[PDB]
Design a protein around this ligand. Sequence first.
Ligand SMILES: Cc1ccc(-c2nc(=O)[nH]c3ccccc23)cc1
Length: 154
Amino acid sequence: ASRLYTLVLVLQPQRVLLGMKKRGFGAGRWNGFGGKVQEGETIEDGARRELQEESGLTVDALHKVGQIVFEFVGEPELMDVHVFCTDSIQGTPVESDEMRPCWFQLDQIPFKDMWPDDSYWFPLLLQKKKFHGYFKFQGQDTILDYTLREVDTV
Ligand SMILES: Cc1ccc(-c2nc(=O)[nH]c3ccccc23)cc1
C-alpha cells in the first residue's frame, strides 16, 4: 500500500534551491520540488513536470539519488518518494501562490524549518551519496523510528 511521489533538489556547487510551500501538505516548510506521479507517466517524467509546476524551472537530465518511504502512524498509505538531483537548469525560479523559491548557501540550509528527516539524508545528498531510507512519523514533527543506508544503485 504505497503511493509514488517525486522530490527534486537543484544542487549547485555552492548553493541549493528550496521552496517554501505556502499551502496544503508541507506548508510552512522549505523543501525540494515534487508531487504525485500520474497514470501513464514515468517517475522521472513526473519529477521533471513537478519541478516546472512548482519552481518554473526546466530540467533535462535528472540523476537518481534516493528512495525514502514515509509512514504516518494511523494512515494506511505509505509515501514512496523518489529523490532526484540536478545541477543544470534553465529559467529563473518563479514565486507563485503555491511556492516561494530561494537559494541557500550550503552552510545555511534551514533544517529547523524543513521536515525533520532532512537532517539525516541531506548531508548524504551534499556529499553525492545515494540512499534508501524509511521514516515512521507520528504527526508531522516527530520521528518515532527510522532506517537510512547508503546504496550504490537507487
Ligand atoms: C511531494 C512530496 C511531499 C513531501 C515530501 C517530504 N519531504 C521530506 O523531506 N520529508 C517528508 C517527510 C514526511 C512526508 C513527506 C516528506 C516529499 C515529497
